[model samples]
Target: QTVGQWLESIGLPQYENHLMANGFDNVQFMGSNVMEDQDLLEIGILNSGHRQRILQAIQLLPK
Candidate 1:
């Protein structure tokens, strides 16, 4: 009940694997360097809207 869930909650269910597969799963989502706008480009989630959504969502995550 985390990124993958919030993903579909935001209507971005398609990218659930795009993130989980790259080791950016529930626990690492907010802790990885891959959270940056640049790394997100190659994370198979190249779409701008999606990246923006995830990145902004990161800001709201518990640090």
Candidate 2:
């Protein structure tokens, strides 16, 4: 199934909306796919503490 389809199956529709807004749509959810590394690069390039907090948030997702 496509990533979008799988997310829908898991009842995580809001996840995509939130991720897209924060530029994390490329990051995989629950190991379903390879996270778009470019998103991490973009976040890192920002060089702000806020970026770190964002990464921290990603790490907190259920495993």
Candidate 3:
């Protein structure tokens, strides 16, 4: 799936622009190894709950 779709799947569709702005315009880069809560914060995702959720989802993604 695309990054937008992945975000939407994890209840963070609103972060698409932020991710794109931070140079993560491709879903190929959304691997569990590459995405971290700190990285998400750098892209402006501030909610701790959301960050945790994103991390969990990333962990669940197929490597």
Candidate 4:
């Protein structure tokens, strides 16, 4: 799936533009490494709930 679809699945569709603008426009790039909280923060995703939800979705993806 594409990064946009993944982000939407995680309930963070709002971050799609920011993430793509920051070069995270693909699932492979995003899953290349575990996304740290600071990474999301740097991308301006400041909501704790959104952060946690994103992490949860990432964690559940096939590794």
What does the lDDT come to for candidate 3?
0.75
**Candidate 2, residues 1-63: lDDT per residue as tens digits?**
223443354444444544555554534463443233455454342433433444444554444
What is the per-residue lDDT of model 4 for residues 1-63, given as tens digits with 9 covering 90 to 100? Answer: 667778888878878887777677666556557667877776677898887877776675666
Report how far residue 52 has shifted in candidate 1, in Å: 0.6
lDDT of 1 by residue, 1-63 (tens): 656766765567767677767656663445343468875665677778988876766655666
Better of 1 and 4 by TM-score: 4
lDDT of 3 at 36: 78
- Model 2: lowest-lDDT 10 consecutive positions: 1-10
What is each predicted model's overall lDDT from 0 to 1? 0.65, 0.43, 0.75, 0.73
Show pairs that collide, candidate 3.
Answer: none
RMSD of 3: 1.7
Cα deviation of 44 in candidate 3 (Å)?
0.8
Steric collisions counted per model? 0, 0, 0, 0
User: What global local distance difference test value does model 4 have?
Assistant: 0.73
Question: Mind giving the per-residue lDDT tens digits that candidate 3 earns over 1-63?
Answer: 566777888878788888778877655557635677798798788998988877776766777
Candidate 4 stretches greater than 4 Å from native:
none
Q: Which portions of model 3 miss their true places by more than 4 Å?
A: none
- Candidate 2 regions exceeding 4 Å error are 1-23, 26-38, 41-47
